[PDB]
Amino acid sequence: ACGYSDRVLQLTLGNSTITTQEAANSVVAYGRWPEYLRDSEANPVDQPTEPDVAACRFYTLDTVSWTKESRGWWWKLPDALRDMGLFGQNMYYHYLGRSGYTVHVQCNASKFHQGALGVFAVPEMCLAGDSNTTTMHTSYQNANPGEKGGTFTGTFTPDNNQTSPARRFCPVDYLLGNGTLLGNAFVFPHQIINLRTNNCATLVLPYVNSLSIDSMVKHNNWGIAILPLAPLNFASESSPEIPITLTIAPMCCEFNGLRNITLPRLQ
Amino acid sequence: ACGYSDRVLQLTLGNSTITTQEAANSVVAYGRWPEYLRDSEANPVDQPTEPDVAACRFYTLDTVSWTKESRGWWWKLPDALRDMGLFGQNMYYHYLGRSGYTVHVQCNASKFHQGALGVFAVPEMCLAGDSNTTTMHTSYQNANPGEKGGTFTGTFTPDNNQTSPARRFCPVDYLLGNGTLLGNAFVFPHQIINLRTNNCATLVLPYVNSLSIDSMVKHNNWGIAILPLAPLNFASESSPEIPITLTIAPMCCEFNGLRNITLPRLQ
Amino acid sequence: AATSRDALPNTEASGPTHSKEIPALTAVETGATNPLVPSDTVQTRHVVQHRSRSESSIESFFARGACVTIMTVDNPASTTNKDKLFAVWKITYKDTVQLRRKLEFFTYSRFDMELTFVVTANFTETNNGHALNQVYQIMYVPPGAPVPEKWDDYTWQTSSNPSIFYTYGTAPARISVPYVGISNAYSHFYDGFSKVPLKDQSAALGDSLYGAASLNDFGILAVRVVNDHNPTKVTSKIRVYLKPKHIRVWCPRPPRAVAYYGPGVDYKDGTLTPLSTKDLTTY
Amino acid sequence: GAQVSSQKVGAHENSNRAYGGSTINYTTINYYRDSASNAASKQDFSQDPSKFTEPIKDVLIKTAPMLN
Amino acid sequence: GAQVSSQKVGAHENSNRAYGGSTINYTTINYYRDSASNAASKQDFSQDPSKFTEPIKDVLIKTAPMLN
């Protein structure tokens, strides 16, 4: 028939609308698409609140610059958003929050650039710290970078300061930060944005967790981790730079047990 | 049959529950009870968000002490709440907000005290300022007292400071603050808490306004104004004091056009 | 209906071609992997494939029973100046590399732990002595119950603590345990903290280690030597073998690449290099 | 309350029945009241690798061009 | 004189029958003539906590006022 060719889409969750044109026909985590909590598998007994449009819409976090020495970036979703409009305010106001997602990683170049960004959505992405003395001692304040997110590194560097430590993650890239080869990482729901072709990757992630509905302030679920597979090159020029920018949208979310406002020591 | 005598009630809007025992069978503003915006009379075209339980529940504002020299108090509802949980956060996040209410004015004494508090719910309660020079010049910061609310006065006192004025309302009590006799004020939806009998008054107020759904940050709707009709007396004692305390609950509310957060100069 | 012991879809025959059909060409961006069958990039004959995946099934992968831990305990002479040794191991597979890597391929798991005990024993000291066939008590002390103080204390009365009395030299003891998880699958990987830090509190009062969930998920095993202080001191070792029976797994995470370090995914330096050398142009 | 099932014999000579014809069964009896004590019945299934191999917001025909 | 009963399986994979359908049973056989020797059949009941919670010389309707 017509130009309804896989390459063009028009996401509209909430009152925001993405409309990409090099679009590599999107991924739906595990076939399973995001949905609300069926009474059959519900847990908490009160009335679950549902921001619906108030939250469900697309929130652009902040852009990351992408050079030659760029070694990758990583977000922790449940947290990554914590500010972004009402999904930020509802986030804290409740003890329990089950939320699904739709991550649209935006990044386009000219026909003359080259490179491939593997956008991997890892469920329960436990990245490893940096203290050869004690394990897991990584500090919260530091463990949840939010809107800014963290960034993979070249080679591991042990934190020696011990009068008082730096308590951060030292996520090495070839080991996908969680001590396990990147080349094998293509097992999680993912899309490679390969500059020649598509100029974005869209993965719809349905809430996955050992519990019906769980916490948010505490426990994280999905975690995005974008790594440059094919390093960026442009013309015999010292160094080129394109700006990768993700926009996430919390879908079918619901929260239980309203309280007083949570105010975590994020500083 | 049983003790389902008018004197006992059990309000449950949201996850909060009031259960008074001297309860004077409640008032429903104008027969009309609070409800959502029927498509037939809707106005703004986007999807209206509805906090439902997230907001609908009962929020206790702060208590007011009630002595002999007490001359009355007044709240501006749409505003009065502005903080109170999510109905506070949703309040600001949208350009339009239609909200209904259920004000339960709590205040009980012993069989030995005496007095009557006329709890009048005045729609569009425009109280008068205090500058015999310019009219309506009353400042916002000052015009919206929130959780704390304002208080009626004995006799009018003109604001003379004019290098720069005090810009406040000077609401006289016999004139219900809006230059109109109190004795005639029994025309608005109301209940007199008469210490001998009932120890609370419950008025359910359905959103009333010339518009389908209007603003909140700006335009106010209902305004409560509690005035001591029968002054408080107890035993040949210098002065007695009972503490009146209201608890409001925003019902069938909905808000349109999400934006960035509003942050009014309330200071 | 498609069980694990079926027989892979038989290879269909296929001759020449020149179609505008383009099986061979993919485009990995879609993340989808071309389900190309041998029958596509070559002319195949009609093979009647008998082979079946009956052994690689999630159930059979974990069909063997792995050694979760070893437990040293010993019965010394009454006159021993030191207190009598009764080992106490906290139920948690994460002690040995083997079963820990198998489970770790998957994000979540629901299994029925079927614990078996191969208990052994020798005479410590050079002294030439004798010992009447010892009997051991393997008391399961549920998360939160009181962990045993002395070797012979009240805690061992076990009025409500699932315990087993193994007589030395006999068919190795076995006790099946059903999914004892608080959640709906044991989370092989927990991202997030057990206590959120809150501004109106001291940095200490509300802190916690990353990845840690429940203080005592599975539980603890108290194992004593039940007999009394005997002149000939006999040390014993109780190797516990856990075999996940009725099991289920979710989200296929990539296998551990570098040597394990502690209960948390963290990794020590040095061990950081896993691969081997090979010339990009030598078979 | 016998649980008789068919084994998957590789048609071995004098095993009971094969290339001379016949089937092979084995009796089972759950003995304990607590299910988590039954013998792992090994009669497990097999799903299609699609929820991992072929997961897209559309459908993919192999003979077709990938990036339409 | 077999005593076959149904176990209360938690619909576990390859346990015999669950979310693919099916039930799970277990055979029992009283072996001793003296009843006080049989295995505690665990198929115990549950009464209403009323003879302890709600014990009154009348009836109590919850929505009603306690002290009438």
Short mmCIF file of N, CA and C in Angstrom, two decimals, chain B residues 71-72 74 126-132 134 136-139 142-143 150-160 166-180:
data_model
loop_
_atom_site.label_atom_id
_atom_site.label_comp_id
_atom_site.label_asym_id
_atom_site.label_seq_id
_atom_site.Cartn_x
_atom_site.Cartn_y
_atom_site.Cartn_z
N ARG B 71 -12.86 36.55 67.68
CA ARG B 71 -13.80 37.22 66.79
C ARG B 71 -14.10 36.48 65.48
N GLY B 72 -13.74 35.22 65.34
CA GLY B 72 -14.01 34.49 64.09
C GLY B 72 -12.79 34.19 63.21
N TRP B 74 -11.56 32.65 58.96
CA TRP B 74 -11.98 32.47 57.54
C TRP B 74 -10.93 31.80 56.63
N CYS B 126 -15.69 37.27 48.68
CA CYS B 126 -14.77 38.39 48.48
C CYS B 126 -14.71 39.26 49.71
N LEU B 127 -13.72 39.05 50.58
CA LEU B 127 -13.61 39.87 51.80
C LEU B 127 -13.04 41.22 51.44
N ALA B 128 -13.40 42.27 52.18
CA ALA B 128 -12.90 43.63 51.92
C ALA B 128 -11.61 44.03 52.65
N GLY B 129 -10.70 44.68 51.92
CA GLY B 129 -9.39 45.16 52.41
C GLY B 129 -9.36 46.12 53.58
N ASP B 130 -8.51 47.15 53.49
CA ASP B 130 -8.40 48.15 54.58
C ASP B 130 -7.71 49.48 54.22
N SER B 131 -7.82 49.93 52.98
CA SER B 131 -7.17 51.19 52.59
C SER B 131 -8.23 52.19 52.13
N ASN B 132 -8.57 53.18 52.97
CA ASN B 132 -9.59 54.14 52.52
C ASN B 132 -9.21 54.98 51.31
N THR B 134 -7.08 53.69 48.12
CA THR B 134 -7.40 52.79 47.00
C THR B 134 -8.09 51.47 47.38
N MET B 136 -9.42 47.42 46.66
CA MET B 136 -8.97 46.14 46.08
C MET B 136 -7.47 45.94 45.97
N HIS B 137 -6.72 46.96 46.34
CA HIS B 137 -5.28 46.88 46.27
C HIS B 137 -4.62 45.76 47.12
N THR B 138 -5.42 44.96 47.83
CA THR B 138 -4.96 43.85 48.69
C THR B 138 -3.99 42.92 47.99
N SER B 139 -2.81 42.72 48.57
CA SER B 139 -1.75 41.85 48.01
C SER B 139 -2.02 40.36 48.04
N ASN B 142 -0.57 38.08 50.84
CA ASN B 142 -1.42 38.34 51.97
C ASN B 142 -2.88 37.85 51.79
N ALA B 143 -3.40 37.96 50.58
CA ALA B 143 -4.77 37.54 50.26
C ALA B 143 -5.12 36.05 50.36
N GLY B 150 -7.11 33.25 57.76
CA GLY B 150 -7.20 34.58 58.37
C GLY B 150 -8.17 34.62 59.54
N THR B 151 -8.48 35.82 60.04
CA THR B 151 -9.41 35.97 61.17
C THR B 151 -10.19 37.28 61.27
N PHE B 152 -11.53 37.18 61.37
CA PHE B 152 -12.38 38.37 61.48
C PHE B 152 -11.98 39.24 62.67
N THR B 153 -12.26 40.55 62.58
CA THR B 153 -11.94 41.53 63.63
C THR B 153 -13.12 42.27 64.24
N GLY B 154 -12.89 42.87 65.41
CA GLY B 154 -13.89 43.62 66.15
C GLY B 154 -14.42 44.81 65.36
N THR B 155 -13.64 45.88 65.25
CA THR B 155 -14.06 47.08 64.51
C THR B 155 -12.97 47.44 63.49
N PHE B 156 -13.38 47.94 62.32
CA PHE B 156 -12.48 48.34 61.22
C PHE B 156 -11.38 49.32 61.62
N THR B 157 -10.19 49.11 61.06
CA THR B 157 -9.02 49.96 61.32
C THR B 157 -8.37 50.30 59.96
N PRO B 158 -8.48 51.55 59.53
CA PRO B 158 -7.87 51.88 58.24
C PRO B 158 -6.32 51.86 58.19
N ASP B 159 -5.76 51.23 57.16
CA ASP B 159 -4.31 51.11 56.95
C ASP B 159 -3.78 52.47 56.54
N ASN B 160 -3.05 53.16 57.40
CA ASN B 160 -2.55 54.48 56.97
C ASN B 160 -1.19 54.50 56.25
N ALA B 166 0.28 48.17 54.14
CA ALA B 166 0.24 46.82 54.75
C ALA B 166 -0.60 45.84 53.91
N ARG B 167 -1.21 46.38 52.86
CA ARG B 167 -2.06 45.68 51.90
C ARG B 167 -2.96 44.46 52.34
N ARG B 168 -3.40 44.39 53.61
CA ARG B 168 -4.25 43.26 54.08
C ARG B 168 -5.76 43.50 54.13
N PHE B 169 -6.53 42.43 54.37
CA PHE B 169 -7.99 42.54 54.44
C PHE B 169 -8.27 42.97 55.86
N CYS B 170 -9.34 43.73 56.07
CA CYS B 170 -9.67 44.15 57.43
C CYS B 170 -11.14 43.72 57.41
N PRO B 171 -11.38 42.42 57.66
CA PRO B 171 -12.73 41.90 57.65
C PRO B 171 -13.50 42.04 58.95
N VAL B 172 -14.48 42.94 58.98
CA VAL B 172 -15.26 43.14 60.19
C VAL B 172 -16.29 42.00 60.27
N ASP B 173 -16.50 41.49 61.48
CA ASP B 173 -17.45 40.40 61.72
C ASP B 173 -18.96 40.64 61.57
N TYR B 174 -19.52 41.71 62.13
CA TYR B 174 -20.98 41.89 61.97
C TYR B 174 -21.39 42.04 60.48
N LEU B 175 -20.43 42.40 59.62
CA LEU B 175 -20.64 42.59 58.17
C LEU B 175 -20.09 41.43 57.34
N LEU B 176 -19.91 40.28 57.99
CA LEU B 176 -19.40 39.07 57.35
C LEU B 176 -18.19 39.35 56.43
N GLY B 177 -17.39 40.36 56.80
CA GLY B 177 -16.20 40.77 56.05
C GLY B 177 -16.47 41.37 54.69
N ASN B 178 -17.57 40.99 54.06
CA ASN B 178 -17.90 41.51 52.76
C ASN B 178 -19.01 42.53 52.82
N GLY B 179 -18.91 43.44 53.79
CA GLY B 179 -19.92 44.50 53.98
C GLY B 179 -21.39 44.12 53.82
N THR B 180 -21.82 43.11 54.57
CA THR B 180 -23.20 42.63 54.53
C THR B 180 -23.52 41.89 55.85
#
